[PDB]
Amino acid sequence: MPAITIWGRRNSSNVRKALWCAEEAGVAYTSIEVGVVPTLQDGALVLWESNAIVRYLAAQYAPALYPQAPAERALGDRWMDWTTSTFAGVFRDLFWGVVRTPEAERDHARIAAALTQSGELLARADAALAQQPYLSGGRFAMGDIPLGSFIYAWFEMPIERPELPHLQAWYARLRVRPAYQRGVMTALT
Numbered sequence: 001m002p003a004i005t006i007w008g009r010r011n012s013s014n015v016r017k018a019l020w021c022a023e024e025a026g027v028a029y030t031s032i033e034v035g036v037v038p039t040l041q042d043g044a045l046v047l048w049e050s051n052a053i054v055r056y057l058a059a060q061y062a063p064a065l066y067p068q069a070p071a072e073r074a075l076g077d078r079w080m081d082w083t084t085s086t087f088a089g090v091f092r093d094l095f096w097g098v099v100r101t102p103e104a105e106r107d108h109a110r111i112a113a114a115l116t117q118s119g120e121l122l123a124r125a126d127a128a129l130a131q132q133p134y135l136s137g138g139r140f141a142m143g144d145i146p147l148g149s150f151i152y153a154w155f156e157m158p159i160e161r162p163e164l165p166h167l168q169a170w171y172a173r174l175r176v177r178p179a180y181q182r183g184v185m186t187a188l189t
């Protein structure tokens with residue numbers, strides 16, 4: 001069995017982050033879904049943090065994805081932290097109310113507020129993607145991966161989205177990557 005194992009449900013955005021990164025690197029890996037947080041194991045290493053798992057997999061296995069100059073890495077680095085620190089919480093809330101709770105249980109005012117704030121948060125990324133074609137800068141790299149794994153849910157969710165055309169063209173370019181198709185575009189349950 002491959003040295004790399006990734007535990008976790010494939011319909012989680014955090015696990016998508018890791019599967020997509022694994023796929024981008026081409027390495028042998030096992031994905032275990034037991035019957036949400038990814039657990040990475042690679043030899044003696046055990047990782048529980050999505051973005052740490054990403055940064056590791058790219059630096060260790062896909063150096064095309066890990067910019068070596070600190071100043072260029074920092075461009076996409078900030079969107080990795082921002083995805084966790086600012087976007088994921090409100091969006092996971094939006095996504096729960098819409099895909100996973102029964103209408104009898106939906107706090108609509110809250111969903112409505114999640115949807116509205118999700119949108120204006122994303123407007124910030126949309127503005128950055130009007131300056132460069134990737135969160136990582138001129139070329140795709142690890143920095144695009146955390147928000148890229150959420151933005152699949154954003155666009156394929158049954159919701160009314162505000163017009164964010166740079167964000168959308170970026171998602172269109174993500175969709176042409178096979179690693180993104182196999183790693184991220186899973187059952188949106």
Ligand SMILES: [Cl-]
Pocket residue numbers: 012013092095153
């Ligand atoms: Cl989600």
Ligand SMILES: [Cl-]
Pocket residue numbers: 034035
């Ligand atoms: Cl099951």
Ligand SMILES: [Cl-]
Pocket residue numbers: 042043044045
């Ligand atoms: Cl190792």
Ligand SMILES: [Cl-]
Pocket residue numbers: 099100101102103
């Ligand atoms: Cl439901």
Ligand SMILES: [Cl-]
Pocket residue numbers: 129130131132133
């Ligand atoms: Cl551009």
Ligand SMILES: [Cl-]
Pocket residue numbers: 067072136137138139140141
């Ligand atoms: Cl770059």
Ligand SMILES: [Cl-]
Pocket residue numbers: 155156157158159
């Ligand atoms: Cl849709």
Ligand SMILES: [Cl-]
Pocket residue numbers: none
């Ligand atoms: Cl479309």
Ligand SMILES: [Cl-]
Pocket residue numbers: 019031182183
């Ligand atoms: Cl997979």
Ligand SMILES: [Cl-]
Pocket residue numbers: 185186187188
């Ligand atoms: Cl599907």
